[PDB]
């Protein structure tokens, strides 16, 4: 019945981790595992210079510093300075409610206001344990305000309208934000960090064969040059082709193109006159006839790309509309054309093969969840990091975290499409026939009764976030943005005169703060120039 | 105006007056609240224990400072449940038996937060050493300063009333009910009707419209809260909502209880609830100034009332016939639905488990919190009702499963009761958590209001380690990540030394619980 200590070592650890791929997923994995495993494991990154990375992935969500760069011990300003980073206070939705061609300029709604709505990262304040969203919704439904949700509930909206920064020049925080950054530069930065600070071995070669033992565990990757890179654990960061998880380990990908329709992008970088126009401290999502277009500003240039369904537009149609949007020469612009899959691996980790980044789960880039899926998956791999016994429970629990995180974001993205009121194109009409997951259906039913959807709540904190990342405030942004309202106000508010009065002060606070900050904050342009030392 | 105009609460006691006080506060004089409570004078001296969120989730909403309510119900401090003789055979004793290693058969379930190193809780660094042969120390002693404090009977606050540790409360239930009744009536304009309900009036849609009283008064209402206790006069009897008997999860179904005068001068006051294993259940000890509440919780399938009574008496050396005993037969389980139509059940009327981890009051204020969140209008939106019910089910089943683990993993085989616990099917949720635990992974890492979210997964990693590791269930192997983390292991060694030192530092400088209570209660 007594505890029996396990033998005097006998070392049963993983000795070598091989990472296939040198995109952001590859080098993020290499940097983080390098930090996590304290020089007890050899880490090798195998990447083919000859096979281009996806060349996109430039907007983020606000937990990137807390969940990833903080673990590496890299302060915010330091990495920002190496990847021409900028500030993202929101995704701003343009022309999602009105029909017609793609235009960067908002059309006019029937109410006279521009067809824009923001999804900011600011926390919503509460009165009497009820978020400001609900007091707004009550007023809107009771015919007591005409005001838009984003305008009433976040000072951030005013700040973004004026293109001011989320920090003062003394670098005091004015609001919550996430980042824009140059994806190529981030990767190079993390590669240099991994190689020079975390002892990672960088092999520049192309995998041509995955070698397995009799039990079907990977033992090595054979390369075109004739190398055999032996390893105990393999991380598939090969991108969409999923060379280890899908091809060698034969793990099915779960196609969820019945949930979300976009599957293609045409992308480019657009030089930009920041002196003239300033810099928008937000990502724009510009609705198109057969999808949408991102705009991701940084100093000197904006990343842009038209995400579309190739069932509803050809590459040429897409490229034409994308080119017209910015006045690009279609014969003279350098376009990156990509096909993406939508869904997840049945299991993200099988045998000794862990998928991370585009080789694992993906939804379209509309709320910038790709990089988030990488560092969340990496965090979870470190937490469930195996030895050579590969305990099936570690594997299972990792897989369950990936599933939950994926499902949580998929729900949120489904909300963007299924409640669009556009019916002008086959694409917008097909988004009203989506296969809706039970869990988003349940959330909509909760929202429609006037109740909060996932009220908000430190590593225990940020990691729990992965299972329920998109909170009440974000759901209000998108539902209320698109025009979906509760059937009626939250009934409890009808009994709470004092609480309603309290929220009136919160509403007045949003106005006052917005006004103060628009006056006092620097332009995004001026703050970037200070930060990056271009002045 | 489709709002609720009148809420009628059937029953007083803690459930009724907690509901009245909180809804009084929540509804801002926009609703008439009535409590219908049978005179039933003879309220005794019933010790009850709680969990740490009582102040933040309940009294803070009412605007009542901790010390104010404590001074009105002879409250004391609970830093843990201490489990005595849960691992060794024989008759009850207040004194712990010796395990084979020479340690007392004691283990604590404190409310302290476990520190972490490198995003890994201390529990896991302890488990690794324990499994690897490198420490003989018990989890509670290694990982909580609180254990040293409780062993010395020191208080969770300094005399200046600054905090040393997390804690919950002991209190006299009758007195808290009186305090709350006075608050509800005098400050929140609740009406106290002292009468017996004789009839529940319902319409053809099965909605309650009024309660008729013995005096002849008809109490019309729009929403009815059933705080009538185990009889569930509204939810079960009038609405015919079925009760789900969960005696296939937990065997205890009865209690015999008394209040025991205590010599605080001689013995000090323990800042914890004791859970003292018996042949056919367990006995609680809930100290307050001058007396401890005590109750033998038992299965009447394994002991008769008389047998339990005698064993209870023997435990404390009481004269059976010269002792005032309260006997109760419990209902263990929950309603199929807590809220049906315009009837919301709260307290024993809704759900119940034995007080092994002090769940009773928690289920009340969680339900109240959720009713005010989901508070309806006269349309009774079925979504509001459904979401309430979901919260209740999940909160209840979660606690029921935590409790089942206390019994399922006891190594005792000495009596039919202790063998019978291991013949029950282990709940699915605990099967899952045990599997997670046995791989060396954390179980429900803590998140720190959405102290609201606390209700859905209330018991966190520290609490599962306390019960599993306390009873002798260990992980199969250390967390594998630890073998790759020499620097983190070194960091955790500093944390273990930190715990030992807090223990010594605090034990030296804290007041006795007795001395702190005498100051708090203004004894002279
Ligand atoms: C259009 C689009 C827009 C997106 N926008 C965003 C956004 O705004 N925000 C966000 O957070 N995420 C976004 N994402 C997701 C994001 O791009 C990715 O998560 C991120 O770039 C990581 O990609 P990856 O490293 O998994 O794959 P890739 O960049 O495809 O890299 C794969 C690597 O595998 C290597 N490889 C392949 N085969 C071999 C072989 N045989 N031998 C050796 N090496 C090999 C390749 O050479 C390459 O180095 C977007 C995705 C798409 C498609
Ligand atoms: N028929 C009744 N009329 C009024 N109050 C009642 C009735 N039955 C029980 N109660 C009350 O419900 C509360 C809880 O009851 P119990 O838990 O059975 O002591 C007490 O305040 C009882 O007096």
Residue numbers in the entry:
A (entry chain A): -8 to 448, 454 to 531
B (entry chain B): 2 to 449, 456 to 531
Paper quotes:
FDHs belong to the class of two-component flavin-dependent monooxygenases which require a reductase component to generate reduced FAD (FADH−) for a halogenase (monooxygenase) component to catalyze halogenation. Several X-ray structures of FDHs have been solved which showed that all FDHs have two separated binding sites.
To understand how the inactive complex forms upon prolonged incubation of Thal and FADH−, we solved new crystal structures of Thal with bound FADH− or FAD. Alignment of Thal:FADH− with Thal:FAD showed different conformations of Thal, especially at the loop around residues 39 to 53 (defined as the flavin binding loop) which are close to the flavin binding site. Analysis of these structures indicates that different conformations accommodate different arrangements of water molecules in the active site. Interestingly, in the open conformation, the arrangement of water molecules connects the active site of Thal with the bulk solvent outside. To elucidate how protein dynamics can affect water arrangement in the active site of Thal, the open conformation was selected as a starting model for MD simulations. No water molecule is located above the C4a position of the isoalloxazine ring. As water networks in Thal connect the isoalloxazine ring of the flavin to outside bulk solvents, we propose that these water networks are important for providing a proton for the PCET process to stabilize formation of C4aOOH-FAD in the Thal reaction.
